[PDB]
Structures are given as C-alpha cells and as structure tokens.
Amino acid sequence: LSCRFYQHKFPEVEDVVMVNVRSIAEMGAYVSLLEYNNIEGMILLSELRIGRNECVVVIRVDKEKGYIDLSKRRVSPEEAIKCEDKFTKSKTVYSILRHVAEVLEYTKDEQLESLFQRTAWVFDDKYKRPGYGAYDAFKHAVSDPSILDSLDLNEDEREVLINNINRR
Ligand SMILES: [Zn+2]
Ligand SMILES: [Zn+2]
Ligand SMILES: [Zn+2]
Ligand SMILES: [Zn+2]
C-alpha cells in the first residue's frame, strides 16, 4: 500500500520537496515527488544523476494541466537541510502508519489514507505544520500517550499505533 505523506496531494509553489530523479530528457529531468505518492515533476533544464534523491523547489504547478515544474538551482544549502530533515521525519511517520496498516491487515490504499487522515493529518492540521506536526506529536506520544486520546480511533487501532510509535 502507498499513500502520500501530507494532507495535500500537491505541494505549494515555493515548497522545497524531496524527489527521486527518474530520467533525463531534452526539456529537463523527470522526477518523482517522494512525499506526494510519487507524482511526477520536472526539473527544468535551466534549473538543473538518475537514481539520486534531491531537494528541489516548486516553481510552478498546474493541477488542471497536470504539470509540476521544479528547480534544483534555487535551493539553498540551509533549505536542503530542512527538506532532508522534514523528509526523514515524515518518512518515519509514514513507516509507522504503514506498519499499523500491516498489523491491521489493510489491503486498500483508502484504509491507509484513512489512518493518516485520523492521525498524522490531524496533528499536521492542528499545528498547521505539515510533516513536523505529526512527527512531533508521535514522538511526544512515546512519553505522553494521552496526546492520542482525542483521535478518532478504536481501542485496537490506538493500541497498535502506540506499539508502532514505541518501536519507532
Ligand atoms: Zn488545503
Ligand atoms: Zn493539493
Ligand atoms: Zn517493514
Ligand atoms: Zn503531553
């Protein structure tokens, strides 16, 4: 099962996003946005290795047309560090919830999405901080499990979530 990391299906213009470079063509490099369920972007040729993960900035989006244009050249080192850090934290949240889904034997992507919606994305929304919100709340749950009390979870879901958070 896959699912994106964050409530939104697309990044906002000016976001720095973690991508995997998939191929190189005349107009630029095609990449998969790792935080957004591997949707495709392009690093414009003017803004520029297959298989490498890189932090790039979102330059233009057109959801109707289907395009995401990106830039490597415009990412500052300080910006790359934050993106690597956000990505690791969010990926950890992802792995936790994916493990929760395995324990509960989810077979459908919507079950995993529903888990995110009722947990990580509640915290991301509560604190208006995508990625970090969920991560910080899950980490806090290690010492203060009550932070999960308000979530719309059944007893088993909660128990399995706490277990998987603890495993980390
Ligand atoms: Zn929104
Ligand atoms: Zn969106
Ligand atoms: Zn595993
Ligand atoms: Zn607390």
Q: How far is the CA of 135 from the centre of ligand 2 (A)?
A: 20
Q: What is the C-alpha to C-alpha distance for residues 55 and 61, in angstroms, rounded to an integer?
A: 17
Q: Which CATH architecture has domain 1-75?
A: Beta Barrel (2.40)
Can you say how many angstroms the Cα of residue 160 is from the centroid of all Cα atoms in its chain?
21
CA–CA distances in Å: residue 37 to residues 1, 6, 139: 11, 9, 23
Q: How far is the CA of 8 from the centre of ligand 2 (A)?
A: 4
Q: How far is the CA of 63 from the centre of ligand 2 (A)?
A: 8
Q: Which two tokens stand for residue 167?
A: 């495993």
Q: What is the C-alpha to C-alpha distance for residues 117 and 56, in angstroms, rounded to an integer?
A: 26
Q: Which ligand is nearest to the CA of 4?
A: 2
Q: What is the C-alpha to C-alpha distance for residues 28 and 19, in angstroms, rounded to an integer?
A: 14
Other beta carbons within 10 angstroms of residue 77's beta carbon come to 8
Q: What is the C-alpha to C-alpha distance for residues 114 and 128, in angstroms, rounded to an integer?
A: 19
Q: Which two tokens stand for residue 149?
A: 């009390």
Whose tokens are 């991508």? That residue is 19
Q: What is the C-alpha to C-alpha distance for residues 35 and 18, in angstroms, rounded to an integer?
A: 7
Whose tokens are 């998939």? That residue is 22
Q: Are 158 and 145 in contact (CB under 8 A)?
A: no
Q: Which residues make Cβ contacts (< 8 Å) with residue 59, sequence separation at least 6?
A: 13, 44, 47, 69, 70, 71, 74
Residue-wise DSSP of the chain = ----SSSSSSPPTT-EEEEEEEEEETTEEEEEETTTTTEEEEEEGGG--TT-EEEEEEEEEETTTTEEEEESTT--HHHHHHHHHHHHHHHHHHHHHHHHHHHTT--SHHHHHHHHHHTHHHHHHHHT-TTHHHHHHHHHHHH-GGGGTTSS--HHHHHHHHHHHHH-
Q: Give the torsion sign (CA, 63, 10, 41, 94).
A: negative
Angle (CA) 6 21 63, round 5°: 50
Task: Give the β-pairing of 67-71 and 53-62.
Answer: antiparallel
Cα end-to-end span (Å), the chain: 19
Task: Give the β-pairing of 67-71 and 39-44.
Answer: parallel
Answer whether 1-75 and 76-167 agree in fold: no
Q: Which two tokens stand for residue 3?
A: 């699912």
Residue 52, classified by CB atoms within 10 Å of its CB into exposed (0-12), middle (13-18) or buried (19+), is exposed
Q: Which residues pair with 18 in a beta bridge?
A: 55
Per the document, the length of the chain is: 168
Q: How far is the CA of 152 from the centre of ligand 4 (A)?
A: 18
Q: What is the C-alpha to C-alpha distance for residues 101 and 138, in angstroms, rounded to an integer?
A: 16
Q: What is the residue extent of each domain of the chain? A: 1-75, 76-167
Class of domain 76-167: mainly alpha
Label each residue of 16-49 as H, E or C: EEEEEEEEEECCEEEEEECCCCCEEEEEEHHHCC
Q: How far is the CA of 12 from the centre of ligand 2 (A)?
A: 8
Q: How far is the CA of 92 from the centre of ligand 4 (A)?
A: 20
